[PDB]
Structures are given as structure tokens and as C-alpha cells.
Design a protein around this motif. Structure first.
Motif, PDB file in Angstrom:
ATOM      1  N   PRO A  27       3.980   4.700  -0.206  1.00 19.58           N
ATOM      2  CA  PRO A  27       3.165   5.831   0.236  1.00 19.58           C
ATOM      3  C   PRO A  27       1.736   5.427   0.550  1.00 19.58           C
ATOM      4  N   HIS A  28       1.055   6.269   1.311  1.00 16.05           N
ATOM      5  CA  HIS A  28      -0.395   6.193   1.504  1.00 16.05           C
ATOM      6  C   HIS A  28      -0.876   5.066   2.398  1.00 16.05           C
ATOM      7  N   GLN A  29       0.030   4.500   3.190  1.00 17.35           N
ATOM      8  CA  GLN A  29      -0.368   3.469   4.138  1.00 17.35           C
ATOM      9  C   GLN A  29      -1.270   4.019   5.239  1.00 17.35           C
ATOM     10  N   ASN A  30      -1.226   5.333   5.472  1.00 18.81           N
ATOM     11  CA  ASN A  30      -2.055   5.961   6.483  1.00 18.81           C
ATOM     12  C   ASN A  30      -3.323   6.631   5.924  1.00 18.81           C
ATOM     13  N   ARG A  31      -3.625   6.441   4.635  1.00 19.72           N
ATOM     14  CA  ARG A  31      -4.938   6.835   4.099  1.00 19.72           C
ATOM     15  C   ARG A  31      -6.022   6.029   4.796  1.00 19.72           C
ATOM     16  N   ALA A  32      -7.162   6.658   5.036  1.00 21.50           N
ATOM     17  CA  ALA A  32      -8.226   6.030   5.797  1.00 21.50           C
ATOM     18  C   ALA A  32      -9.142   5.171   4.916  1.00 21.50           C
ATOM     19  N   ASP A  33      -9.009   5.327   3.606  1.00 23.90           N
ATOM     20  CA  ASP A  33      -9.902   4.637   2.687  1.00 23.90           C
ATOM     21  C   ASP A  33      -9.236   3.413   2.085  1.00 23.90           C
ATOM     22  N   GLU A  34      -9.816   2.897   1.007  1.00 18.83           N
ATOM     23  CA  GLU A  34      -9.376   1.637   0.445  1.00 18.83           C
ATOM     24  C   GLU A  34      -8.001   1.751  -0.184  1.00 18.83           C
ATOM     25  N   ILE A  35      -7.561   2.954  -0.510  1.00 17.97           N
ATOM     26  CA  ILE A  35      -6.219   3.075  -1.064  1.00 17.97           C
ATOM     27  C   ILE A  35      -5.179   2.825   0.024  1.00 17.97           C
ATOM     28  N   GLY A  36      -5.518   3.166   1.260  1.00 18.78           N
ATOM     29  CA  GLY A  36      -4.686   2.835   2.402  1.00 18.78           C
ATOM     30  C   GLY A  36      -4.576   1.329   2.594  1.00 18.78           C
ATOM     31  N   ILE A  37      -5.688   0.632   2.445  1.00 17.43           N
ATOM     32  CA  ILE A  37      -5.714  -0.830   2.505  1.00 17.43           C
ATOM     33  C   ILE A  37      -4.791  -1.411   1.440  1.00 17.43           C
ATOM     34  N   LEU A  38      -4.901  -0.919   0.211  1.00 21.27           N
ATOM     35  CA  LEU A  38      -4.053  -1.420  -0.858  1.00 21.27           C
ATOM     36  C   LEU A  38      -2.591  -1.085  -0.586  1.00 21.27           C
ATOM     37  N   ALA A  39      -2.329   0.096  -0.040  1.00 17.68           N
ATOM     38  CA  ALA A  39      -0.950   0.501   0.208  1.00 17.68           C
ATOM     39  C   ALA A  39      -0.317  -0.419   1.244  1.00 17.68           C
ATOM     40  N   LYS A  40      -1.063  -0.775   2.281  1.00 17.89           N
ATOM     41  CA  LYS A  40      -0.561  -1.717   3.267  1.00 17.89           C
ATOM     42  C   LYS A  40      -0.266  -3.068   2.625  1.00 17.89           C
ATOM     43  N   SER A  41      -1.104  -3.493   1.689  1.00 21.55           N
ATOM     44  CA  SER A  41      -0.846  -4.758   1.000  1.00 21.55           C
ATOM     45  C   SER A  41       0.421  -4.703   0.158  1.00 21.55           C
ATOM     46  N   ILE A  42       0.680  -3.559  -0.468  1.00 18.95           N
ATOM     47  CA  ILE A  42       1.886  -3.385  -1.261  1.00 18.95           C
ATOM     48  C   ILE A  42       3.106  -3.385  -0.349  1.00 18.95           C
ATOM     49  N   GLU A  43       2.970  -2.821   0.849  1.00 15.06           N
ATOM     50  CA  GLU A  43       4.035  -2.865   1.833  1.00 15.06           C
ATOM     51  C   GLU A  43       4.305  -4.305   2.253  1.00 15.06           C
ATOM     52  N   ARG A  44       3.270  -5.136   2.387  1.00 13.35           N
ATOM     53  CA  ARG A  44       3.497  -6.556   2.651  1.00 13.35           C
ATOM     54  C   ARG A  44       4.287  -7.216   1.527  1.00 13.35           C
ATOM     55  N   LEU A  45       3.958  -6.904   0.280  1.00 10.38           N
ATOM     56  CA  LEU A  45       4.719  -7.417  -0.848  1.00 10.38           C
ATOM     57  C   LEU A  45       6.171  -6.965  -0.791  1.00 10.38           C
ATOM     58  N   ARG A  46       6.407  -5.694  -0.464  1.00 12.33           N
ATOM     59  CA  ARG A  46       7.771  -5.179  -0.366  1.00 12.33           C
ATOM     60  C   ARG A  46       8.542  -5.961   0.687  1.00 12.33           C
ATOM     61  N   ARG A  47       7.917  -6.186   1.835  1.00 11.82           N
ATOM     62  CA  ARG A  47       8.564  -6.898   2.937  1.00 11.82           C
ATOM     63  C   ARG A  47       8.908  -8.338   2.555  1.00 11.82           C
ATOM     64  N   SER A  48       8.023  -8.987   1.808  1.00 10.62           N
ATOM     65  CA  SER A  48       8.294 -10.338   1.332  1.00 10.62           C
ATOM     66  C   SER A  48       9.433 -10.370   0.317  1.00 10.62           C
ATOM     67  N   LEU A  49       9.488  -9.390  -0.572  1.00 10.06           N
ATOM     68  CA  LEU A  49      10.551  -9.318  -1.560  1.00 10.06           C
ATOM     69  C   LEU A  49      11.890  -9.101  -0.866  1.00 10.06           C
ATOM     70  N   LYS A  50      11.906  -8.218   0.122  1.00  9.29           N
ATOM     71  CA  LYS A  50      13.130  -7.897   0.833  1.00  9.29           C
ATOM     72  C   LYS A  50      13.601  -9.100   1.635  1.00  9.29           C
ATOM     73  N   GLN A  51      12.659  -9.892   2.141  1.00 11.85           N
ATOM     74  CA  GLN A  51      13.000 -11.108   2.864  1.00 11.85           C
ATOM     75  C   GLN A  51      13.622 -12.154   1.950  1.00 11.85           C
ATOM     76  N   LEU A  52      13.024 -12.371   0.779  1.00  9.54           N
ATOM     77  CA  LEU A  52      13.563 -13.346  -0.170  1.00  9.54           C
ATOM     78  C   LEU A  52      14.933 -12.904  -0.649  1.00  9.54           C
ATOM     79  N   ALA A  53      15.127 -11.599  -0.834  1.00  7.05           N
ATOM     80  CA  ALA A  53      16.408 -11.084  -1.315  1.00  7.05           C
ATOM     81  C   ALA A  53      17.486 -11.267  -0.252  1.00  7.05           C
ATOM     82  N   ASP A  54      17.149 -10.886   0.972  1.00 12.02           N
ATOM     83  CA  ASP A  54      18.095 -10.938   2.074  1.00 12.02           C
ATOM     84  C   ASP A  54      18.477 -12.381   2.324  1.00 12.02           C
ATOM     85  N   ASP A  55      17.521 -13.286   2.132  1.00 14.37           N
ATOM     86  CA  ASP A  55      17.744 -14.714   2.329  1.00 14.37           C
ATOM     87  C   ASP A  55      18.601 -15.330   1.226  1.00 14.37           C
TER      88      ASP A  55
END
Lengths: 110, 110
Positions: A27-55
Motif C-alpha cells: 500500500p501507499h506507493q502513490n503517497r506524495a510524501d516520504e511514506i510513498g518513497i518507503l512504500a516503493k522501496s518495500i515494493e522493490r523488496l517484494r519484487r526481489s523476494l518474488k524473483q528469488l522464489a520463482d527462480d
């Protein structure tokens, strides 16, 4: 300050992802403030986890697929070996079959 | 706000981890507040990434160590081949090296 609730939401989702729910929506990837920044970073972590799992799930299939090429060429070479070297051709082919059994059997150990 | 600095710090940490620095230290974990809750969640994501990397690495180490035996046997067999079959010994040795390189490549992804 209505920073608390969105932060807890983000943390809860991060926890669920870490625990195995790799498709959960961050959630909150579209917040305009720093929580949006953090949310995008957490989404990067999710994407990396899903990549390692799928691999990890495709690893044995990948290894087997790629090794097939040189192993098949080793077999071809044995087929071309001389009568004198017949016993070595057979021994090598048994080794190839052993590679095949190791690869196929591998998943069984579990 | 008074928590903006640590939010951005945690986002930078998360980015570094997502990019592959799985050993990065996650700050602020021992805090009781919103920052601490987020930090602990990010540490959980880091731990899960590191575990999946360790899992894949363990499996490839197993594949390498099982295949070493038959590949070594093939290598020894080529040393016994006749001179007339030298071209085939060379081909097979090249293909053993290819097998080793494929395994290396899969070890490398992790």
C-alpha cells in the motif's frame, strides 16, 4: 498524525510478504510524501523476494535443461568412438546416465 | 516531520537490500514507535531474502557435489582413449568444461 495508520499498514504488509505472501499489494506507493518513497522501496523488496522464489522453483529444471546440451554432445562423441575404445564409450555413457539420474532424482530428496 | 529522516534512511536501506546487499544492517530496530515497527518489518524482509538465497545456494552446492563424481569419471575415461580418438577426447573434455561452466553460472546467480 495520520502518519501512524499508513505506517502500520505498510509494516503489516511487509510482514505478510516476508512470511510468504509474495503477491500481496504494497500500500501507499502513490503517497506524495516520504511514506510513498518507503512504500516503493518495500515494493522493490517484494519484487526481489518474488524473483528469488520463482527462480528457486525453476532451478532444477533450468540446470537440467542447460546441461542437456553438452551431455548430449558427450553421448554423440561416444557413438563415434572406435571399436578399441568401445569399453570407454560404454563407461562414459553410464556416467551420462548417472548425471541424468542425479538430476532427475534430485527433487526426490526433499 | 521528526520522523522523516529515519523513514528515508529505512527506504535507502530497503533499496540497497533489494539490489542485492542482503547483509545490509537495518537501523532503528530497537525502537518502540512507528520507526521501530517499520524497521523490524524491513529486517524480516531482509532475512527472508537471505534465506531464499541460502536455499538456492545450498541446492546448487548439492547439484555440483553430486555431478562432480560422474564428470570426473568421464574425464578419467578420456585420458585412456586411443590416439586415433584424440579428437573425441578433446571434444568430450571441452563438453565437461561446459558442464562445469553451467553449474558455475547457476552458483553465481546466488
Amino acid at each position: 498524525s495520520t502518519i501512524t495508520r499508513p505506517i502500520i499498514e505498510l509494516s503489516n504488509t511487509a510482514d505478510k510478504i516476508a512470511e510468504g505472501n509474495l503477491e500481496a499489494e504494497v500500500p501507499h506507493q502513490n503517497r506524495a510524501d516520504e511514506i510513498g518513497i518507503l512504500a516503493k522501496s518495500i515494493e522493490r523488496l517484494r519484487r526481489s523476494l518474488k524473483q528469488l522464489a520463482d527462480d528457486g522453483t525453476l532451478l532444477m529444471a533450468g540446470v537440467s535443461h542447460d546441461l542437456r546440451t553438452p551431455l548430449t554432445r558427450i553421448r554423440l562423441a561416444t557413438e563415434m568412438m572406435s571399436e578399441q575404445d568401445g569399453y570407454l564409450a560404454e563407461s562414459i555413457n553410464k556416467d551420462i546416465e548417472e548425471c541424468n539420474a542425479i538430476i532427475e532424482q534430485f527433487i526426490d530428496y526433499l
